[PDB]
Ligand binder design. Structure first.
Ligand SMILES: NC1CCN(Cc2ccc(CNC(=O)c3csc4nc[nH]c(=O)c34)cc2)CC1
Ligand SMILES: C[S@@+](CC[C@H](N)C(=O)[O-])C[C@H]1O[C@@H](n2cnc3c(N)ncnc32)[C@H](O)[C@@H]1O
Lengths: 237, 242
């Protein structure tokens, strides 16, 4: 069957058409590399207008997603995963910050159940009991976990065999050779494979040093890379 | 509308994820947000051209051409009218998005977002037209559509009438939340939330926020220092945690 099974618990399963119908995620679903399923907590409640949230204990603004509707959707999702070891992830701004290293780790799992919260969040007792890991996509607050869950699925899907450094990328250029007073660097126009590979690596090193030096501190630079970086720095105005 | 957003993307219909659901949908209905899309594929030189061409100097993948991006941008700039529109390219090379950045972006009257695919756009388009480059985090995605939506959602939350004290607001993670029932499967709601006054609840919530930030995101504490009262609440959380 599929290389990676993903079950999403969300009150907006339709939002997930952004990944089921587009790009590498759509391709992986078609190619059978990825199985994507949704589980609306709104169908694991017992009322006419379908409610998932209740007021927070201790007062304050907003509402909190109840334990029962989430436990419903989770149990159903766990059953459909079958004999796969499924890691339960809650998407949250309190979680561990997602990075490419984390993406690689998540890509090694055979099944993921992603919980997309809404409102002020979900009842802490649901988290303590059922959530294996909490993950954040960045230091900003969103209205729900759906876009984060999709960002996670997209990043992980890229790493699946058949779907498709610690440095920023080099600039890219395409047709035409000259466009409104701006011209393409000559090394890409007629240079050799080593001339282009050295220029691209130097531009990548240079751009990382300018904008994301923290990425260089973590990284291990070779003698050749130290020379290309030094050169980029002393040759710019 | 309070905020006008134009998105430049080869997949405008992916944006139904924000135009039809959640707070972004409500803001579009309430007229607080205007959301429009601009497909570069309809701005090619001729209908037989793709948006992308092969990269100069070889290597894997394709690169989005300047000409379609420029047509989509000029058209979006015209529809923005008399609004000062900030041009944003969503990119993993950009400035990392944070709640502080979202607040700054929320003060703009118009935004024009540029979303490219996995192989990137021509540097000359960026140099010439892009006002700001923003990344949503240190991970690699297949395109800028999900990042552009993450940005619109974060900014929309700050619009008056769309929904002030949550995670990264004051440099702290949030406290845990609890709802009905009082006891669920051998687990009970903290007593202070059932029987405490407003000051008891405030100190407990602040203490939980400080302890959770100290446990998971101590970097946030380094930036945002701690007052005397907060140091005492945190010292107490640490010694009583287990
Ligand atoms: N063959 C090369 C491999 C690296 N590529 C760099 C690159 C360019 C664009 C993307 C697509 N990502 C985004 O558009 C994006 C936009 S915002 C964002 N934030 C975090 N991560 C992201 O990937 C993004 C991914 C990688 C260029 C082609
Ligand atoms: C308004 S937020 C709740 C934020 C609140 N400060 C809390 O206690 O987590 C609603 C939901 O969106 C998701 N979410 C918000 N920002 C996120 C982020 N940066 N990363 C991951 N998920 C996020 C979570 O699933 C969260 O339950």
């Amino acid at each position: 069957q599929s290389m990676l099974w993903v079950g999403v618990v969300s009150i907006f399963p339709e939002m997930f058409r952004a990944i089921s119908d587009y790009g590498i995620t759509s391709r992986a679903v078609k190619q059978g590399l990825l199985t994507l399923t949704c589980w609306n907590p709104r169908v694991y409640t017992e009322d006419r207008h379908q409610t998932v949230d209740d007021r927070p204990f201790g007062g304050g603004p907003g509402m909190v997603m109840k334990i029962k509707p989430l436990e419903g959707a989770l149990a159903d999702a766990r059953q459909a995963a079958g004999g796969r070891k499924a890691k339960v992830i809650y998407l949250s701004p309190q979680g561990r910050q997602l990075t490419q290293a984390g993406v690689r780790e998540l890509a090694e799992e055979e099944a993921l159940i992603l919980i997309a919260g809404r409102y002020e969040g979900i009842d802490e007792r649901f988290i303590e009991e059922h959530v294996d890991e909490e993950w954040s996509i960045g230091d900003y607050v969103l209205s729900g976990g759906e876009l984060p869950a999709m960002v996670l699925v997209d990043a992980v899907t890229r790493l699946l065999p058949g779907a498709l450094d610690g440095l920023l990328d080099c600039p890219h250029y395409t047709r035409p050779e000259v466009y409104a007073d701006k011209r393409v660097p000559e090394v890409l126009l007629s240079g050799n494979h080593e001339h282009i590979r050295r220029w691209r690596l130097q531009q990548a090193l240079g751009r990382t040093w300018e904008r994301r030096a923290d990425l260089l501190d973590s990284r291990s630079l070779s003698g050749e890379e130290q020379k290309l970086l030094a050169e980029y720095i002393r040759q710019r105005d």
